[PDB]
Amino acid sequence: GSPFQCSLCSYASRDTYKLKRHMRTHSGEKPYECYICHARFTQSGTMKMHILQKHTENVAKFHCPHCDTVIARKSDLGVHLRKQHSYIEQGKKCRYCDAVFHERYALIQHQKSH
Template structure:
């Protein structure tokens, strides 16, 4: 039987001590690896390397179809769905499909009636953050005297 490393905070177990140590940081909040530019902390060195691309402008991932470049591999994979027309996220209520999980999450609010963004001025509620922010700008406009 292989030795595992059980987390004392939750029920997860890890095969490797290095995985266990990184996981522990999710509970302790420790972020020992710092960005050399902005000093933001991260749980593992690879996260710092990826983060530093924000500062350097490096975009190592390139779409082979339209040649657009991306900072993260995951962003490239999501982008490629534009070309493939893939829509892997399906609404369990109406079966409508979406290319991005976030779009499905917003869509599901139609069925649940959830409107999580509420205006502090007029108390009107909104389903989408963008619509809410556009509405807030209306309140910040000054009326001509």
């Protein structure tokens, strides 16, 4: 069980820190500020990612192991991987011929050959 129950929604947590942090989703409080562009964020880790992706140079990026797409955030590569390079049991037919593929990247690359 988790005793700390949010007074506004159905969220509940085991400790007060996370309930306080969740309450920022209701109050709209943004405690953290980028010292460069003065944008504000709900969490400190979000601000750190903002400064890395917007105000830092020479930042290494993540190449997809199955195509040449380069993606800035590792989690966004996950979304790419789950969308483009994941098995589709029901398959997808080319919109120009009867060829069927089981990953979206294969479908899109084949369709381009027409």
